[PDB]
Amino acid sequence: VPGQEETVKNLEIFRLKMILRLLQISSFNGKMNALNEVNKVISSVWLTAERMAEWIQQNNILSIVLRDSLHQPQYVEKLEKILRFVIKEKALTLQDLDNIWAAQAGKHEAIVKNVHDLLAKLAWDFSPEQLDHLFDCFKASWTNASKKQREKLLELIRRLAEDDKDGVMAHKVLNLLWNLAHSDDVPVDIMDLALSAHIKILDYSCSQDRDTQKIQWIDRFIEELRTNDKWVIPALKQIREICSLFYRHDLINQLQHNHALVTLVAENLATYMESMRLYARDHEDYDPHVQEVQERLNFLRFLLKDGQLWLCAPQAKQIWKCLAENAVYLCDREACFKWYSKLMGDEPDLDPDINKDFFESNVLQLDPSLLTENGMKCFERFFKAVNCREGKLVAKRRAYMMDDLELIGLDYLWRVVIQSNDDIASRAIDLLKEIYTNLGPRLQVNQVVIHEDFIQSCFDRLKASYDTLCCARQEAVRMVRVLTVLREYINECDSSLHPRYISFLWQVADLGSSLNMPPLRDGARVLMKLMPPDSTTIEKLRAICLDHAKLDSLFFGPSASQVLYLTEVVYALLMPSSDFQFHFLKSGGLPLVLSMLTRNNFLPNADMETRRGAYLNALKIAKLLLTAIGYGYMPDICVIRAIQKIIWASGCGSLQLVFSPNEEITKIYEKTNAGNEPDLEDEQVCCEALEVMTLCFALIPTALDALSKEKAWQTFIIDLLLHCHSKTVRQVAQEQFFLMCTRCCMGHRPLLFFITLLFTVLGSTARERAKHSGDYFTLLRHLLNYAYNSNINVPNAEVLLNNEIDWLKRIRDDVKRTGETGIEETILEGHLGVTKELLAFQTSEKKFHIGCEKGGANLIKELIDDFIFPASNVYLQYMRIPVCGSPPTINAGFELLVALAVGCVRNLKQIVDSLTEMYYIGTAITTCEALTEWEYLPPVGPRPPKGFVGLKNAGATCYMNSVIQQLYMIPSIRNGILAIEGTGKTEDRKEYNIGVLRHLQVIFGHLAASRLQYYVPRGFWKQFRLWGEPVNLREQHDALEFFNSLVDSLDEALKALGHPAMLSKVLGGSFADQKICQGCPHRYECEESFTTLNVDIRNHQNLLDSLEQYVKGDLLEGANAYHCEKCNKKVDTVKRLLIKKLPPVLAIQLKRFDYDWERECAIKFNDYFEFPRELDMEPYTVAGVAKLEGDGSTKYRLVGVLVHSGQASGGHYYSYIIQRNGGRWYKFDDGDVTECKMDDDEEMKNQCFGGEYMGEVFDHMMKRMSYRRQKRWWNAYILFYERMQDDELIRYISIERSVRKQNVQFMHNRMQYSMEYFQFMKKLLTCNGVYLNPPPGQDHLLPEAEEITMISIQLAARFLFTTGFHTKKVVRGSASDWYDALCILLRHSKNVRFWFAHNVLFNVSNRFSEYLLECPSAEVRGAFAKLIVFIAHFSLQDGPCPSPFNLSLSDHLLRAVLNLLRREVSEHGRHLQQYFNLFVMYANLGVAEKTQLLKLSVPATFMLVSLDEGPGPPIKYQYAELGKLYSVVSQLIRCCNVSSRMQSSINGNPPLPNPFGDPNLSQPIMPIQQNVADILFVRTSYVKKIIEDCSNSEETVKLLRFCCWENPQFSSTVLSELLWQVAYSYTYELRPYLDLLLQILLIEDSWQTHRIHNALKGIPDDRDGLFDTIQRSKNHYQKRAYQCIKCMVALFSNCPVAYQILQGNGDLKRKWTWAVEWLGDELERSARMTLAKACELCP
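== Probable ubiquitin carboxyl-terminal hydrolase FAF-X ==
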């Protein structure tokens, strides 16, 4: 209705009222609809934009909306357009803006950032009053902002600036940024944050209003730091960052025209350094300074890199002389030196003129006493740059090579080296040596002048320093440094002439000991040594020696250090010079060297080292002097006393007490605070004096006899054997005491005296030391052995043996009582050795009354079952701690047992009986079995002591064993599981869980007490089934599934047995899933039990970030907002997971695996992840979050790292575990447990931290290099953390047999296959060897020898053919020795040989096959073959042996070996060498053996073999080496008569006798057998076989030479085959054929001419023969033609018969001429010599 107008406005106002009340409705949906309809009506807008603006203003619509709706981004997005509509007609006021800014006062972060992005989007349309009002509001917030508040305000400001479309508002934005970054009330973090904000605002907003003010803003910054109120550093880095991006190369010049930075910053540095120095005099009690000076320096450096500017002198002056030269803090000087180091690297920046100015002006003017390491490199580069510009040095490759001598800098570099500390002096010395030693062109001809001038000037400086001494201490350092200069200078010279040079240095070294300066003497002596001997001294000594031959003052000069040097040069002359010895001995040599040692006034003012060196040199001289005079008297007793006192003093490290009354030296020997250890140079003095004493006693024997009665020469030996140190000295002393008593004694009394002396210190001093007795016992053993072997009778032997026996019994009683020896290992080994050596001095009635006697002390029994085999006795008891633990002690016990067994059959019998019943009674009762493995060791391992027990891997079982290791290593688990007693379809699952617990108990006990290296889990693999389905041992699976199944099964087993869930309590945790809503105060909490902690790995880099992700949780918003069951609406909710209960042990999983749908397979992620050793879980727990928001330890230590290495489908698992010890990490992989070096962080990064790295790849035989990015596919998978035997886990709520058995079996088997056991076996078998010889007038063994042989052969057979030869080479040890022992036993006895054959070779029916063919060891097969040959040889004289299925044992052995040829030989190729080698050896023995082989038709059967057609199948291995077969055939055939097949080529002439039969054979064994002739001469297969295959052999040529003699048919066949081989064969194997043909052509029988005719020409009209092959090979394959020509040259030059054939047949001469002409032409285009000899035979 047109007349209804006011009602239209009334209804519009009512609609406004209803909408406003709808906004007032607390329901968000009502406010949602009201906001939507407000947006709708505003967009459609009698209603203009003014009236809605007012209505919003007075009603404060925004105020109601802003109070709650700001928590949702969509509400802000909707309100944005309403705010824009309000603003665009100037309706928003400051109070409304204040309310907008009041929204961030104490509100949540989401609301604050919502307000911020709203303001950022609205800032474009705000009026200037609104914006600057917002700006001082920002400043007011800045006044009270927190740390996060300040950074979010900066983010808001950057949002505002980025959205600035027109660069007008950014002016005030940057003004505020400058105000904030230059306000000192705000910490340094917000400083750099605001600076970065400013820089990024100026960088990428360059669309408009950024350029052309860059200069304006940078000039504003320059003017800002042009005044000094601490604006300098921030403005400086501002300008530095602006110039980093913002044309730049000419920009520096533009800012150099009128606003120079380098100069202005130079004045800044100067006027600020002086400002600090103003208060540095009174306020010095503070600390550095560094932060600002380094920043300004780095500004200068970055600015002066690419601007192409030259640093002028004035600013260089003002920044060098005023900055560091006159400074306060030493760090400023460091900064300046690092500056002048970096500035001039490889390129000048100050121009050569200015450098040559300032370096000489003030850099060299600096006092070297104040200069540091950076100064060294800067000063070096200053030299190099300055000197290489003037034209004095050349850079060359690296070293700045010298071309001048008058340096401008060396004048004060000497001042630097003379006045500095150690490091600066070392650098200066390096500079001087690298500048002086290397001389190049234009000066390379002047070595002598420069070196001499340097040495002379430097020695003059040394003298100038020297004259001041007579302030003292530092000049010593001056001398040391200058002598270091000398020593280095000569060090680089090699890679003197002036006598004054050593004459001054003598006095220099003399002063070194005068005022007691160590380095002076050492440096002087080193310089003297590193020098050729002085020319004057050597000629003077030689002239004096010549004068006196046709000198005391020379070696007794009053200067101290010159005597030592003169002794050094003397020893240099003696030791290579051949003439000077005779001169030295003649004049005064021996007497003066000895009086050198026995006098008191040798060297009054002597140093601790001067006497040492002088002595040691005189001793080395006297050793060779006595060695020379040995072959052919001056030494006396006083010389011995002097040398012994010298050794007394030197063994104490107290050579200065070499004039002691000999009681004090004993006093410091007797454990005087352990401060008398001999040095590394007293050792040589002691040793050399020992050889001197030995040689002197060799000269004079009677002195040592007289020394025995003295109290000295008794304490001397005791001290040097027990009370001394430096084990090498003791070893030398014992060796040479033994040498003295062996050779120098010339009697038996000294041996008895030393033996008695050594035996009286056993219980007194040999036990007190207990560690130095290893050589005292060595002397005891050696002296006793020598006394036995030399038929010397020790007086008191039986009583000492009884004492040793009682001591051993006491030791065994101590071991039985406790389990540990009360002594050391050396004492036990030495006592066992002494008991062994004392055992030789008894008859056979003794050594049997000790061991094996009914009433004696049955020492064999206690030995066997208490020292060596207690474990074997335990094992024997089962089948119904050893005293000798260390391998040396076991060896000593073995030696004692052998010494008991030697010479006594009644002791060997019992030892053998015990050994058989303990090891070889199980199977070796009728036959000897085998291990079926031919290189056998116990495959279990030793289990090193400090290590642990691993677990066997079947190939894919790592994800069980690693988890089991990790679970066991937790002490609570290992204590709890083993303590659960009584463990030995619901019921089926209950029994399954019980079995799980029982198997875990068994494996835990095994790992706790097994002595093997690892364990192989039968029951573990048999019992467990994964999720019911059986576990496949060859199938890879995730370790997490197995861990979950195992922990669930163990918890079920514990619950079913009434025990608490220990695994759940220790490892399991519980998450507290919390849901907190933003629009309503409703909160939801629940508990979720878990066992392993899962952390994201792809999107996280460290464990801390992953754990903080749980605290942050996830936010549900929009369509994904959580629906509240109470409010019945969707609202934003923060879903976070917090740990409620903290387990003592925490398991954390790394989610490094996922699935790829494109690849249709599991994939592995190897992203770089981090985890610390110590973890603080408190911030991530419920308590920590509650404490932070404001409404039982929490720290954990990493102890176990499960690591995966390989593909996701496969891969390998292992562990890294900390062992809980009271005073570490270990490597747990499968059955191996080893130490690891992962404690370092770099190893942690390399091994388990994973990640990508820039790998280096080497390929193409180390000639190609490439860089490839590689991923660490080996990385950690689960992390175990331990918090910092619990009765609760054992308290109720609702077997050690297998370990012992397997330990005992392991010990028994390990003892069986020990190396020491094999040496013991060798000793036992080879002992009694001197008793096994027959009587001289008889050829059979006496009763005792026969019994010993029988017992030894029985035990040797059992041992060897059960486990001896099958053991691997390392332990079994060169079975040739076993063969030698078997030979020693077997010979000289017929019954023993028959027993061995019958019981070892003829009762298994497989011995020969397995030991000759099936054995994959050349040495074992060879030893067995040689043994068979031995037995066959020595059983020929024996009677007829019974047949083992008038035949001797040799016949049976040969038949048995030949029976292998029926089927066994043609199965075992690559192993046939030793079989036919056995046949070779047997023939070589003699004529009877050859006859025996021939009567067996061995040659015929052997010839058939290698041509198939044999007794059995052909050999399957086609590449069979049958050389020894051909050798046997050749040797056997050559011992036969072939005279039937001979023709002399002249009618009526008888054939010549054959010279090529077997030598050392009087007459042929028999006429050649028909079956042999049929294969040799009638048939041609064997000849071809041996020609084509048996090449280079010495037997094939012998056989062919023997058979071809006077045999036209055989010679024809051989020649045909040889010519075929010469023509049609490879040229690399033609030399053997040509050599064999040459040897055939040299047979000087009556067919030689025919053979030569048929070889040179060939078979007529067949184009074969040497000439035919030469003609064919002239064009191609010329090497064959050359080799044929060489063979013909040899034939013509070595055969007189085949030179008349050539000379006498014109056609052959023509062919030879053609051949030699071809060879000459080819060589014109060894060969040269062959061609030279070719036409010396030409006519």
